[PDB]
Amino acid sequence: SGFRKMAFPSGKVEGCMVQVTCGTTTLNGLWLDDVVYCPRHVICTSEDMLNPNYEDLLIRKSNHNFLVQAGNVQLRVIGHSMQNCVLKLKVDTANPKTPKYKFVRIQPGQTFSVLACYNGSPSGVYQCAMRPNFTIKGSFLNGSCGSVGFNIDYDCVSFCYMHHMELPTGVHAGTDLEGNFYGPFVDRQTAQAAGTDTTITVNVLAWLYAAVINGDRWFLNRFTTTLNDFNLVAMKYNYEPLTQDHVDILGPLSAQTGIAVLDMCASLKELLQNGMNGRTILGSALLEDEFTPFDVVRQCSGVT
Amino acid sequence: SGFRKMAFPSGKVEGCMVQVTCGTTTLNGLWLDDVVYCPRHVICTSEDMLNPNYEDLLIRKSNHNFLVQAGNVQLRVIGHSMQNCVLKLKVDTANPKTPKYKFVRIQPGQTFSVLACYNGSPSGVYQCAMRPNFTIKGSFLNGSCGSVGFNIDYDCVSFCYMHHMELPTGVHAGTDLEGNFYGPFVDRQTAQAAGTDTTITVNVLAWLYAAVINGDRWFLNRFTTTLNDFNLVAMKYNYEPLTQDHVDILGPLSAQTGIAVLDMCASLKELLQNGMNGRTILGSALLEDEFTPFDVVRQCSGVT
Ligand SMILES: *CC(=O)N1CCN(c2ccc(OC)cc2)CC1
Numbered sequence: 001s002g003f004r005k006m007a008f009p010s011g012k013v014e015g016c017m018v019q020v021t022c023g024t025t026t027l028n029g030l031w032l033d034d035v036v037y038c039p040r041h042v043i044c045t046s047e048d049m050l051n052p053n054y055e056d057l058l059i060r061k062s063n064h065n066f067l068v069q070a071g072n073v074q075l076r077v078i079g080h081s082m083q084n085c086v087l088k089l090k091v092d093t094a095n096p097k098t099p100k101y102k103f104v105r106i107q108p109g110q111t112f113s114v115l116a117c118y119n120g121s122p123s124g125v126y127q128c129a130m131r132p133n134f135t136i137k138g139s140f141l142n143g144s145c146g147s148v149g150f151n152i153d154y155d156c157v158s159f160c161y162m163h164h165m166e167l168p169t170g171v172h173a174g175t176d177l178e179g180n181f182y183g184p185f186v187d188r189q190t191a192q193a194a195g196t197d198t199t200i201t202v203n204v205l206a207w208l209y210a211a212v213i214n215g216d217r218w219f220l221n222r223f224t225t226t227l228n229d230f231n232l233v234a235m236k237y238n239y240e241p242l243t244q245d246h247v248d249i250l251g252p253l254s255a256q257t258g259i260a261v262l263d264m265c266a267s268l269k270e271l272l273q274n275g276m277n278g279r280t281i282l283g284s285a286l287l288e289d290e291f292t293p294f295d296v297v298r299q300c301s302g303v304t
Numbered sequence: 305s306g307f308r309k310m311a312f313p314s315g316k317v318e319g320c321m322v323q324v325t326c327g328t329t330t331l332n333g334l335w336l337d338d339v340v341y342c343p344r345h346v347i348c349t350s351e352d353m354l355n356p357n358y359e360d361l362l363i364r365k366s367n368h369n370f371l372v373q374a375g376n377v378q379l380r381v382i383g384h385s386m387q388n389c390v391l392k393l394k395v396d397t398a399n400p401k402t403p404k405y406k407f408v409r410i411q412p413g414q415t416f417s418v419l420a421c422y423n424g425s426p427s428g429v430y431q432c433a434m435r436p437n438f439t440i441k442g443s444f445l446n447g448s449c450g451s452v453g454f455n456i457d458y459d460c461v462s463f464c465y466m467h468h469m470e471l472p473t474g475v476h477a478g479t480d481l482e483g484n485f486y487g488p489f490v491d492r493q494t495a496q497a498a499g500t501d502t503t504i505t506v507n508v509l510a511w512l513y514a515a516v517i518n519g520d521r522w523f524l525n526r527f528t529t530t531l532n533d534f535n536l537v538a539m540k541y542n543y544e545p546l547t548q549d550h551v552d553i554l555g556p557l558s559a560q561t562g563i564a565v566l567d568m569c570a571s572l573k574e575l576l577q578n579g580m581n582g583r584t585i586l587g588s589a590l591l592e593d594e595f596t597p598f599d600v601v602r603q604c605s606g607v608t
Pocket residue numbers: 025026027028046141142143144145146164165
């Protein structure tokens with residue numbers, strides 16, 4: 001029993017983190033096979049960052065300008081290319097610790113682990129979600145860019161995020177490992193504001209199922225609802241519309257607990273309308289939305 | 305910016321996790337040098353667990369009864385001994401991945417990372433605190449016993465916890481790596497209830513400092529207090545007494561923010577008395593007490 005915000009074990013990703021320096025800028029790169037992946041803004045002077053022309057800035061860079069260090073050993077750069085907002089530095093050595101890996105682009109509401117790094121060295125691991133506004137709520141100081149987000153499926157690391165940007169409101173923007181930003185964000189120091197940070201309804205429901213499984217049941221009530229009725233309340237509270245696809249996804253948790261998805265919706269509806277009244281669920285005073293239904297089943301069943 | 309509940313990178317500990325089987329019981333062991341450490345209750349039939357005599361049960365066990373598997377490779381057990389509530393299985397092979405390590409016994413209020421494992425395989429990593437009642441609030445299913453808690457100081461893993469027990473109230477009990485239980489807990493299936501789960505005041509203050517550093521300032525007020533006045537309020541709310549030692553520990557955060565420790569105490573006093581009024585601090589609706597002052601300075605500065 002117990003239910004914790006849990007990251008994937010980080011060892012397979014620790015084995016891939018290197019330091020990338022270009023001029024006076026040091027950040028992180030991801031070393032897979034003979035390619036190091038890093039944010040293209042490694043080539044920018046903070047001056048450049050106001051209105052960078054990356055193709056033009058990159059012309060002034062040679063392979064020997066990209067200093068790539070794995071622990072205390074230098075890697076030899078034998079090629080560099082820009083793909084969208086990442087650079088791919090071809091090195092003469094395959095990372096011997098390269099795990100089985102995929103590059104995946106996740107959807108809003110999907111969770112992942114971040115290995116926060118500075119100068120190619122791991123500092124910590126935490127669990128994030130892609131927010132409906134395509135930001136993430138991270139922990140990233142200067143030097144942390146090129147830190148990556150990932151899921152693990154047994155022995156295969158799916159990389160989904162590389163850190164690039166902090167918005168003036170302290171939330172985070174980044175790319176997939178093809179260098180495409182999540183959401184409308186750009187690697188430029190400009191007026192970019194996040195849209196509404198809506199609550200991931202299907203995740204909240206998953207976490208209420210986790211709560212029931214783990215003995216927290218006070219919020220169960222005598223009510224049910226319909227998707228349409230629930231969605232009127234969701235709308236009012238800046239929750240994502242619940243779809244039949246979400247109901248279908250919650251089926252296994254419904255089955256295990258014997259609580260119909262729409263009954264748990266009516267519980268969530270009452271919590272939205274009435275609040276917690278100073279009570280907690282799984283040690284939280286708010287409705288947690290960074291556990292997916294897959295996360296809850298994984299943690300409640302003990303997958304490795 | 306941003307502030308997350310952050311675990312240490314788990315790779316160095318992943319490298320130490322093995323499977324231990326005795327009869328029909330499988331749990332986790334920690335392999336350091338040529339010793340595998342595991343809970344002594346691996347020798348118990350669930351029947352034995354009501355009133356086990358461990359010395360007597362251990363007489364029926366030989367080296368060849370302890371099946372120790374590192375990934376898919378068996379380790380040869382050449383000795384076994386009981387130390388307090390752990391077994392030390394001497395194996396014929398030093399773990400080649402043994403990191404620099406220490407065994408430390410932590411105090412209540414100290415935080416650590418747990419690598420939750422099943423059958424010697426890592427499932428996830430999360431951040432815990434030793435509670436003032438000597439429980440931890442973990443995520444541990446059957447098979448997770450022998451999972452360990454740790455801090456890292458650069459390249460040295462300090463192991464502080466091994467998981468043994470769940471109490472009927474769903475909280476966790478375990479030992480240090482010398483096999484001494486934290487608190488009054490025993491490895492027997494008996495009436496053991498946790499005492500008051502008091503809030504770790506110095507940690508809450510550290511986290512309020514983290515909040516100010518990261519832009520969350522609404523709870524700052526025009527008041528101050530004294531340790532004695534604050535402690536009257538702490539007492540009433542089941543918070544730990546704040547000591548001058550705690551004030552001294554918060555000095556660096558005081559200095560960095562320019563907020564006197566006793567002014568932050570007066571902020572915390574108002575939050576205790578008035579509540580959050582539906583507001584959040586660093587995305588929490590309650591006062592977070594599982595960040596130490598050391599954790600806040602580490603995360604806010606970017607140590608690796
Ligand atoms: C996210 C990251 O690691 N980077 C972007 C910002 N960055 C930076 C460092 C130092 C200054 O001035 C002192 C400005 C920006 C480093 C790379």
